[PDB]
Structure formats: C-alpha cells, structure tokens
Amino acid sequence: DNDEKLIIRCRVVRPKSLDAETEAEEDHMLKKIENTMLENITLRGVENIERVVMMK
Amino acid sequence: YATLTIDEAEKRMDKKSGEVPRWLMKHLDNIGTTTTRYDRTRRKLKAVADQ
Amino acid sequence: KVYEESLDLDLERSNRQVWLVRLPMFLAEKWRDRNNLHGQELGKIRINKDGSKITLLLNENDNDSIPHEYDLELTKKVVENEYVFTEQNLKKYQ
Amino acid sequence: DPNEYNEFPLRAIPKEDLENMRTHLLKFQSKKKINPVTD
Amino acid sequence: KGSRFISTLQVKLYGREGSSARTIKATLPYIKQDIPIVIIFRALGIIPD
Amino acid sequence: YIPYVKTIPKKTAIVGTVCHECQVMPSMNDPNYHKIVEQRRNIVKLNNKE
Amino acid sequence: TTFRFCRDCNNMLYPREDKENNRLLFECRTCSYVEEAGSPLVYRHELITNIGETAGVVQDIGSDPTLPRSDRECPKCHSRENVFFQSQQRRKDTSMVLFFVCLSCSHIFTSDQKNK
Ligand SMILES: [Zn+2]
Ligand SMILES: [Zn+2]
C-alpha cells in the first residue's frame, strides 16, 4: 500500500511439455485471461448486487 | 506474397478452427503449397537448365 | 504471323521529364480541344533562376477575355510511381 | 523585370500525331519506388 | 433524381464491451449476409491493411 | 495453371515519367483578372433548365 | 501502443519471440519481413482513459461564435482573451472541469485545482 503506484505483475508458467504451436497465440492467450480476470472475478460480495448505499 | 484461393479462404473463414494461426502463411510456404508465379517459373526454368 | 509488330512495351522514351498540370475550367476548355493544337506557341513558361516560383505567360491570342499571367503552383515537387504511356492498335496482317 | 530567370517556349502538340493514339496516366500504388526501366 | 428508390447500408459493431473480439460488419444490398469491412475494402481495390 | 487466358494485345510505350504536379492559378495582379471571378459567379447564377 | 506497418507490403506487423536471443521481433504474416522492437510494450487497455478531453482544438477555434469567452489569465503568454469548453468525452462519469484555449498563443490550460 505504501507504494506510490499499486501494480500487479502476473506470469503464466508453462508445463514441462513444450508447445510450439502456442507461441503464436501466447500473447493472444494473455489477453483472453486478462479479459476473464477483469470480468468474472469476485473479489467479495453477492452476485447481482450492483451498488449499496447506507441510509439512516 | 503467395495469396490463397477462394475455396481455401472460405474453408478457413468457416469454423474450421477458432481463428486462423498467426503464421499460417509461413507454415504453408514450407509445405510447398501456395507458391507464387515468380517461384513457380524459376523452379521450372531451373528444372530445364539442370539438363 | 497474326501481328507484324513487336508486342513488348517500349521502355525507350521513359527517361523524359513530364509535368502533370491541372488547369482551370476556362483554360482547360480551350487547351483540351482536338480541333486545335496545330503546333502553335501556346505561350511561355518562366522559371526563376533560383527556383521556388514558376509562372506561365500566354500569348496575346486569348482575345483579352482571360488572364495573360498564371502561377504554376507545384503541389508536389518530387513525384514517384507516376508515368505516361500511350496506346494504339497493331498492324494485323503478316 | 530583370532577366534573372529562364523562359522556355510552350507549344501545342501537332494533331497529326495525336490521332489513333491515346495518352494515359499510369500510377503505381505502392510505398516503395517502382521504375520499370531498372527494377 | 433519376430512380427515386432507396437502398440502406448498415455498419454494425458486433459484440459487447465485455467481449474479447468485436468486429465490424457491413450489410450490402442483395447479399443476404453481413460482410467484414476489410473484405469490402479489398473488393474496392485497397488490399494493404 | 490455366492454358487459356484470352488476352487483348495492344501497342504500348512508356513516353515519360511525371516529375512535377502543377496547379495553374490565374494571377490576381493581372488586369483581366476578376473576369474569371465573374465567370465563376455566373456558374452558380445560371438557370439552364427552362 | 505505436502500431507498426510492414516496409514492403504495408500490412500490419505482429510480435514474435526469438529464443535464440530472448528478444522481441515484429514480423509480417505474408511477406516475411522482420524488425526488432524498440519498446517492450505490445498491448494497452485503458479502462479509465482521458484521450479526447481536448479533441477538436484547431488553429481557428476562436472563430467559433458559440464558444463562451472568459477573462482567465493564460500562464504561458499573459493574455486575458480565451475560449473555454467542457470535456469532450461523452462518458457519464467525467468531471465538469473546463479547458481554456488562448487566442494569442494556442496554449491549452485547465481550471482543475484538485489534480491538474
Ligand atoms: Zn509485409
Ligand atoms: Zn496565451
């Protein structure tokens, strides 16, 4: 938190078997997982609950 | 740059796969398919100069 | 035998400087006439010794109905990939 | 004005050589330089 | 002036903002299918992307 | 390949290379100038249809 | 992102990795032309973007009779005439901060006092 900028760095670790066909879509895969990790990640809360406001 | 044909193109456009491979042209160039007139002529001319 | 002339494109006069000039309507309507162009002097083209400015001076044949002085504005000083080619029929026998 | 310039005559093309012949403009659409004389 | 008939051209942006691939397709008269815009551009003579 | 292509031969020749693209514009310091302006104004004024 | 285009056919280049040097190369998918990248960045998604805040500023923006005038001081030439306008991004989340264009030096400044 004390850092001036709040940054996450992620790396996908490849299996022991080496894939020669996936290199062309390697960066393509990152964008796909990047899209999924933005949308379908539930940090916390109840699904279908858009916003909550406190009133007295 | 060794273009495809309409029939080959349409097979790729349809759901043969999720998306065309990025280096498909490089792959098919080595198989021997999809050459150019320049290469198609040079190899034939060399096929005559060899004899 | 069907053609008595070479069918190859003639790359002999290609090394010839050519200017692509866009004309105003009043001037293009009398310079593009095929009932004209008998080889007469349409005027003179004047270029400053140091360049950067060109001007066209027509003769006094315009009948004092249009300007006698024009400024050739170089919209492109260096032009590439533009060429002029002719086209006519071939002799057909032997 | 002073003769600090060069003026060449501008003459029309004789129509005796402009018949049965059409002069067109050719434009190579590319980003490199194409010269059919050397290339 | 000349024929008085109307032909409509629609350029559609398929997909939503939560999609990983949003392409553009155009509807041409008497074609029955929405063609990608790039194909139409190449059909008009502009091949370079 | 294809054995028939149905070409149309013609006599062609490259007779020049373009070096300058020019735009002829009448000089505004010319006496007969502003007759063109009126001519260009008559272009929009005209009512050819009857 | 600085899109790159091919030198021989003008098509779009794509990033490829060469393990012989562990570097980044940009190659064409049809004509086999390669070029080493100058930057290691290949993609950027701008969820909160500010591209378009001052879109439409031209050399004759002051000629627009509909743009409001102001008396604010330009902090690059010290002139008082200027035209101001709100943000041009039509997302319904943008602030009402103003942007000022000076009619004497074409400098664009802002009224923001929070972040600037
Ligand atoms: Zn290329
Ligand atoms: Zn100022």
From Swiss-Prot, chain A:
Coiled-coil ranges per UniProt: none
Tell me the compartments it is located in: Nucleus
What effect is documented for mutating residue 16 to R? Impairs ubiquitination during transcription stress
Report what the protein is called. Answer: DNA-directed RNA polymerase II subunit RPB1
Q: What's the PTM story here?
A: The tandem 7 residues repeats in the C-terminal domain (CTD) can be highly phosphorylated. The phosphorylation activates Pol II. Phosphorylation occurs mainly at residues 'Ser-2' and 'Ser-5' of the heptapeptide repeat. The phosphorylated form of Pol II appears to carry, on average, one phosphate per repeat. The phosphorylation state is believed to result from the balanced action of site-specific CTD kinases and phosphatases, and a 'CTD code' that specifies the position of Pol II within the transcription cycle has been proposed. Following transcription stress, the elongating form of RNA polymerase II (RNA pol IIo) is polyubiquitinated via 'Lys-63'-linkages on Lys-16 by the RSP5-UBA1-UBC5 complex at DNA damage sites without leading to degradation: ubiquitination promotes RNA pol IIo backtracking to allow access by the transcription-coupled nucleotide excision repair (TC-NER) machinery.
Q: Please give the record's comment on domains.
A: The C-terminal domain (CTD) serves as a platform for assembly of factors that regulate transcription initiation, elongation, termination and mRNA processing.
Species, as recorded: Saccharomyces cerevisiae (strain ATCC 204508 / S288c)
State start and end of the fragment within the whole protein.
1231 to 1286 of 1733
Swiss-Prot record, chain D:
Q: How is it modified after translation?
A: Phosphorylated on Ser and other residues by TAF1 and casein kinase II-like kinases.
Q: Where is this chain's protein located in or outside the cell? A: Nucleus
Q: Which domain of life is it from?
A: Eukaryota
Extra remark beyond the main annotation? Present with 1920 molecules/cell in log phase SD medium.
Q: State what this protein does.
A: TFIIF is a general transcription initiation factor that binds to RNA polymerase II. Its functions include the recruitment of RNA polymerase II to the promoter bound DNA-TBP-TFIIB complex, decreasing the affinity of RNA polymerase II for non-specific DNA, allowing for the subsequent recruitment of TFIIE and TFIIH, and facilitating RNA polymerase II elongation.
Q: How does it assemble?
A: TFIIF is composed of three different subunits: TFG1/RAP74, TFG2/RAP30 and TAF14.
Q: Which family would the database say this protein is a member of? A: Belongs to the TFIIF alpha subunit family.
In its UniProt entry, what is this protein called?
Answer: Transcription initiation factor IIF subunit alpha
> What is the phylogenetic placement of the source species in the record?
Eukaryota, Fungi, Dikarya, Ascomycota, Saccharomycotina
Query: What gene does this protein come from?
Result: TFG1
UniProtKB/Swiss-Prot annotation, chain E:
Residue range from the parent sequence: 246 to 294 of 1224
**Similarity comment: family membership:** Belongs to the RNA polymerase beta chain family.
Output the superkingdom of the source species: Eukaryota
**Localization annotation:** Nucleus
Look up the further comments and give them: The binding of ribonucleoside triphosphate to the RNA polymerase II transcribing complex probably involves a two-step mechanism. The initial binding seems to occur at the entry (E) site and involves a magnesium ion coordinated by three conserved aspartate residues of the two largest RNA Pol II subunits. Present with 18700 molecules/cell in log phase SD medium.
Q: What function does the entry list?
A: DNA-dependent RNA polymerase catalyzes the transcription of DNA into RNA using the four ribonucleoside triphosphates as substrates. Second largest component of RNA polymerases II which synthesizes mRNA precursors and many functional non-coding RNAs. Proposed to contribute to the polymerase catalytic activity and forms the polymerase active center together with the largest subunit. Pol II is the central component of the basal RNA polymerase II transcription machinery.
Subunit relationships: Component of the RNA polymerase II (Pol II) complex consisting of 12 subunits.
Identification of the protein by name = DNA-directed RNA polymerase II subunit RPB2
UniProtKB/Swiss-Prot annotation, chain F:
Localization annotation: Nucleus
Q: What else is known?
A: Present with 520 molecules/cell in log phase SD medium.
Complexes and interactors: TFIIF is composed of three different subunits: TFG1/RAP74, TFG2/RAP30 and TAF14.
Q: What does this protein do?
A: TFIIF is a general transcription initiation factor that binds to RNA polymerase II. Its functions include the recruitment of RNA polymerase II to the promoter bound DNA-TBP-TFIIB complex, decreasing the affinity of RNA polymerase II for non-specific DNA, allowing for the subsequent recruitment of TFIIE and TFIIH, and facilitating RNA polymerase II elongation.
The entry sums up its family as follows: Belongs to the TFIIF beta subunit family.
Entry protein name: Transcription initiation factor IIF subunit beta
- The protein's gene is named TFG2
Indicate the span of the full protein covered. 201 to 250 of 400
